[PDB]
């Protein structure tokens, strides 16, 4: 998680704003700067190295006494900054929305993975510029089209159907916010189209999930892509997603939530998220998560046995 | 796959036989040696380096035109040979049984792993010599007590409750017959005590198996320990075990065969092995392996769900 | 051993076909792709990475379950694909030949040795483009000129005359179907001028062969170049050639077989290949190969002894 | 090529002599010593480092102005020296033959190979001391036993029959006097038992030689073991074996020569060595070497063809 | 020591000759070529790799049975070949001299050092092309202006006053014809201007020579530059220069000699080379080299003392 | 340059003194101690690590604000300390001489070279304990014997005749007080037998010196061994030794001086040291050093030419 105000800053074109990145050494210098408690929100100027973000975000960068911030001493920082610039400048930004446009939250891992799949010379985000442009727009939130496979968050395919795609997030090769654990592994599943999916395709996806990844749980953060993560973190995501909905109950922010087909999503998480979007209580709604309730072993029958007897060849 | 006549040869003690290993240099010499007919099954004497096994086994040693044989160019060879010596010498051998005692088949990987287990100082096969002696006797076949956990084939533990132990065979660090394939992962499961096992322990084992290892199929080779291997090779084992029974239907060896609890072993493999030991046809009996069965997904009910909602915290 | 439909695919220009290579990432994605039956011979579209060959050829790519296919995770795959592209596009292809043009078998090692030759700037396949076109076009099989030295399959020279050239195939530095063995050495011998050859040159070549390579046997595959391999594999070649002639007795397929001068080719292999082209049994004709028959130990007199007393200084 | 006066020196037991090695530092010191032209054969005493060989041998040690001498700056120089100790100390040496027993020429490479052999704990020269003692006695020349296989000069076995053994001299890992060339490779062939040999064993040796080593010639230095070397140096050996005989025509030293069986040895070299033993002229006798005399390709017939149709399976 | 026929060959412009280098792979191929007699002195054509020098020069290339010729496998070969081409083409070569122009002996080390100095940008043979051209002309022997400092053969400067320059030849970093000896150091001293030199400069040079290089002896080969080499190799140079004057006594080639000042050159070598050029006996003239001749110890007096008491500060 | 009170301290045997080394950790601890200005010369007690030398020597040990002291963190410190202990304890020490016997100066490099000589198992200071004992005695100044060769200060020999030995001090592989320069090189020349030396040996030493080392000057510090050092550092020695005599003019200290044969020692340094021992002024006597006075170039005649003409063969 982070704000867009940590990769660029606006600069007047006398009509509109051109966004410009920061310099590693510049923000490095600002980190050790010290200024009065009156101007701790306006952008700082490391006189030698250029502009640098305000001291307000001083606690969001990897310093000596706090390493829980974004690492910025790596080329990936300038890469993602140049990407955000190249994307935002095309979008004509006004002077009354840029105040909040530069504050749209974004999991910087998304942008990092966009960068990794953009510099590869085979991903179609290498040839077609407008595709990458729309992709970064969506990854920032300035578009309406939900993320689809053509504009997905990258990674290596691990399974594909005629209507789906199962990316395997590799959050261990990153250089901005790499995960400490060497055991953390998380899958994403996106759609190739936005049309009502058939039943045979969903049957195949359910088969592959409940066979090769039965040690994982299928959830969703409310956008158009099934997240998949180990049960040993479900309780996390709920709370981690709960605020994302709760803080969106506050006016001026969109509460648009997208739950997917209950056939594949985890039925317990399905009911929990339904009662969440319903408008129920804070914690008593989460109580339905730990409520062990599963009469059928798996949602459907006669499927795992099919793969069992299939792979025997 | 190996015969005992590739690590030792008998020598006369005027009352019994002392078995002595080979010098890897001596076998290497005999390999590129040549002798006339009528003597290709008589022990050869590399005059410079000592005795060496007859040229009969010439095609069973790792040379640059036949890599399908055992290696001898590593210290593991002399180690396993010295172990076989230390074991067989104590067992008093006659002058009319060594003829086929030195021909008892043995999975060289078993002896290799037992060696790599006796050298680690933390295992009880380091202190108690008689335990090591009994274990090597079992691994050779000169005793009746089936293998138990105290005398298992080594490897790193993965799961135990009170009557089971799930060894994870590591066939990728061996230096005698290391598996060329990168994806060769096999799990053995042995008993802690030969007494009839309760039902709670079996239910716990089936839970752990059908949760953490549902991509595997529990089979047995007819001895007292559950094998575990991917379905993508189960068929092999059938044929790979079939001769082991068929070549035992002819006299000269015992046809003794052990089953396990039908409640865990893969019921298709169970019925196949049952109709195998029954005495039916060769391939028409194998036909029951490919015959789809099990109109339910798992043998028990409401078990995987318990582990699902268990790990949620 | 491979088919042309694994390096490129056709694409319409509204007049003719342009051939386009694959993206290794795209074919790796297709590998895990699951598609319904009745369609598993159609070119697949990895939505993210471009087109990819149909799943029909799934079993012919180096994965973790099948390491017996063409490797593609190296740059040599894209290199040879671009070479085949640069080759075929020049040849104006119709819409009634690409059906079986992309099915002409080709020893992938041949194209590998080509691409390892066009990049070494010393050779003339670095300067004259049309020579390279003709060379790879022959290697694909779309012309009637047999391979000559100017257009040979590369490798390092080891001996020459006024009419011959003895390449030493190096199948150990390849990356596309490299030989697993470290003791597989094979020699090729090609002609410089397709016109009939004299007798002094053949005397010289037979001298050099029966002196420096008397531990090798001279055979052919039915084209214009003497293969040379250790006797310890002749039998293999036999059957590996037999099907090539057997599957070609099918009508509509060229069965034109070229046998070279009997004066140097292995007389037993010569008679076998003659009785093969005559048209006879499968194995009873092969029986002439294993039949020992040698009236004169070598077909000439005064060459081995000549080199013996020659090299004395 | 070396004299025994470069590894040890005699010392008085008041009754007999104990032979003591040199300190490599002491010989290095003497190397840069300068003494008057009156005592340039007396043993020099590097006062700091113990006795050192006389200055007469200055030209026989490797310095930066004469690198054609022995290398002593490696550990091997001590080993071989100590190895000579346990040889000569046992043999009671007379106060009248130490004058010339320390000048018996010896190919240092022989002793180096033997010391490499005695340290490999699998050879029988590691267990039985008296065997090592006898072997060093032979390699020095103080016994009449011709060097059999048990006492061979060591190396890697390559081929073995019931009466022969074909060592492959490895003169490239020697740290005392390696070869000026780095493609040099030379084989030795010794007899297992000094008694006469049959006609089947010799025929098999001739077959193996004319098949796997037809690019070599079988010669002999006069002792009881067939040397085997490339024709491209045979002439050298001639003069190298000429002087060692001619200098033995100078009475006072034994000229005992032993040419081996003619059926295997190179017939031209056989006739040359015979006319050498006759006492004929110097150069007109060598003239028979370069002269091409080819009645028949070999005193045997039907051997190359036999191995040809043998290896075919 | 080399001939010009090992780096280029002539090619017709229908009017004049363009010289073209050899593809090292092509000469490597020719090395193994076996062409009939009567044609062994005409340029060979490795059909695959281009032209290559005739087989006459076969024994002048570093192979594994003759390591006494020039190496060609290194990039320095193509470098010096391109240099010789770039130089010779400017010179208008006729059709009645090229036959002997391509046979002018040249110390390959000279060209090697010249190319290793023309790549270092600080040297003036980097900027001025015509200077490089004149220098290579001199090094080939197609002009009359003796080598001066501006056109010297490179190396590290060690000493300069006004009229001399003392290069330190580094024949150990070369890659074409390096010195197998690890310890070989040979200095050269060239003039700065062909005009007569004063006495103070010569006295300074003699001081520096008889002080810093007392362990060397100044000689000259017959050019305008003093050689300097250890006394331990004077004699060699003697005969090495003797043939150079002797073979030039044959008419058609220049026999001139440029003896330098008598005050600095080794007076014994001075008198010897003078009696050489006088036209006297072959070896009785060389006897003047070993005959100790001393009119004075050193041609100057009271000079080493000046440098002794000079450096004391 | 060091004082003996930096490797050991005395301890009471109730009758005499046992000398014991320091622990490098203990002295490192003492270095950072801060004791009152009343006891800065009493031995300190780093109570954790054992006794440590007084803080008086605080500035004599290497620390990161004073690196001009003696490194002690290496193993050679404990080595030389144990050597000094092993030497001093054997010597019976009173209770009124330990006051100043622990203050007799010693060139730490001398003891370092001793310990690097004692561990080399080929020198006679390895076997004979009493020899090493007398050597370490004289290296401290507790004996009358001048340092002969049998007890020399180690190093590698470079030249010996019958009464001299030219060690080449290697002050670059040391660890206690190594030299920071790469150009510093110093030779020592010691006598073998303290008896008067003849003329032939002296002439030979002068030959070797004025030929191979004419870029060095021979001096003496006032003991029985010629130092040899570059002229570029005579003056330093002239003053470095001067105090060594001047501070010995103080009553109660020995000023014995041993100037050697003027025939070989630098005659200017000879006269300077003579007028030094005479008892004259400080700088007006040193003035004779920079005075240039050299009628004969060297005290001998016709000697350099001898080696000149000698080395020619």
Author numbering:
A (entry chain F), B (entry chain C), C (entry chain E), D (entry chain U), E (entry chain D), F (entry chain A): 1 to 313
Text taken from the publication that reported this structure:
NSP2 is a multivalent, nonspecific RNA chaperone with high nanomolar affinity for single-stranded (ss) RNA.
To visualize the CTR conformation in solution, we determined a cryo-EM three-dimensional (3D) reconstruction of full-length NSP2 (henceforth referred to as NSP2) at a global resolution of 3.9 Å. We analyzed our atomic model of NSP2 to evaluate the distances between acidic residues within the CTR and the basic, RNA-binding residues localized to flexible loops within the RNA-binding grooves. The distances (∼10 to 30 Å) between acidic residues within the CTR and the RNA-interacting residues are incongruent with a direct competition model.
